Amino acid sequence: MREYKLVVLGSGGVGKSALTVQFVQGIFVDEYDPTIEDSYRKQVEVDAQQCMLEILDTAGTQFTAMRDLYMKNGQGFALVYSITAQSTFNDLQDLREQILRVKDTDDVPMILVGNKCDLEDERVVGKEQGQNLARQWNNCAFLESSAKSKINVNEIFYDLVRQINR
Amino acid sequence: MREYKLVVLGSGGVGKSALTVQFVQGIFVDEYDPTIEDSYRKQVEVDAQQCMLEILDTAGTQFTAMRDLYMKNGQGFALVYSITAQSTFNDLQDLREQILRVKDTDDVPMILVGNKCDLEDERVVGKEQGQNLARQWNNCAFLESSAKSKINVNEIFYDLVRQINR
């Protein structure tokens, strides 16, 4: 049984914690409690194999000392934005470049996540913006998700696992 | 706490059981054991309400007297085919007509499911075929899923709950 060190990144309020808790516990966190650093461990079955996922849910893009540590130790990275907030989308390019500079390679398990897709009446970021960005990131994996509706949540973390096994 | 009686139907071998066991238990059933009738109960959180889901996983057309009792009693229906077998997609039409006869109306919570979307190389039923079929069924909900990859599994049952709630 192998361990997978997964890291959830993004600006404040995009739904990093809600996605994590929805995947780990199966409930929706309606509160917004600003995160410093939380970690979760969960044994799941991915592609017929038992896996120990350790999910690190981080502070805003902030606590710089910890940020350097989880970029060197993380095996897969979910870069999360909110479809309701253009600035949180623009914030991701810098993150992606920080990760690659620390890993010293572009071959880094990664997934781009547009969260809050249930909020169609507040969407400012089109799905095709995220698709085009992911394409620029060397055909990065891309998903629109909803932690509130439990849409494409486990798909985020299971895809990271498959990337790491490759 | 409300109860929801969901029914998974389709021809044999399409993934009815694997989708159900994936959702309820979180494991992928690699074997094909022909079902007569299996039931599962599971409490989940849907749109911030605790819900008791009763999932009936049914046989492949076989057991015609049994069929009428689970069609009268089901509140929502997942109509499942396999994207690798054209015959299982054609069988879904006479299955939906039987739900509409038994319940006397066409406002029945329903989702059409093309399963085994992880088997792209073996695809025979194009995605647009499924989208067209859903549209002519009174703009029916439509998903392509993979019980093996855990893609769009819970999204099937959560959407039926939402249709029942509305």
Binding site: - | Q25, I36, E37, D38, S39, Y40, R41, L69
Partner: protein
């Protein structure tokens, strides 16, 4: 030679399964079929026994594993005979 359909409820899993059981074979062999249809989802699985639940004019009791299945007349409640798989 023969087979009949029996609905078996496993309360500890909150699930029910319709199984083809051999009425002419012992109860332990019917329990063997129940075990094989659960894969390995039941912890401590061998401490479970087939149980006839209470029903109309009929008290609940564990089936004697050395008797043939057909020596227990089915309950008349339901369209299909019903048994449960219960911990001891």
């Amino acid at each position: 030679a023969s087979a009949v359909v029996v609905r078996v409820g496993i309360p500890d899993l909150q699930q029910t399964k319709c199984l083809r059981l051999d009425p002419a074979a012992p109860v332990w062999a019917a329990k063997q079929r129940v075990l094989c249809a659960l894969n390995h989802s039941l912890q401590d699985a061998l401490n479970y026994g087939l149980f006839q639940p209470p029903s109309r004019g009929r008290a609940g009791k564990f089936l004697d594993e050395e008797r043939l299945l057909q020596e227990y007349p089915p309950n008349l409640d339901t369209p299909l005979p019903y048994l449960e798989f219960r911990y001891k």
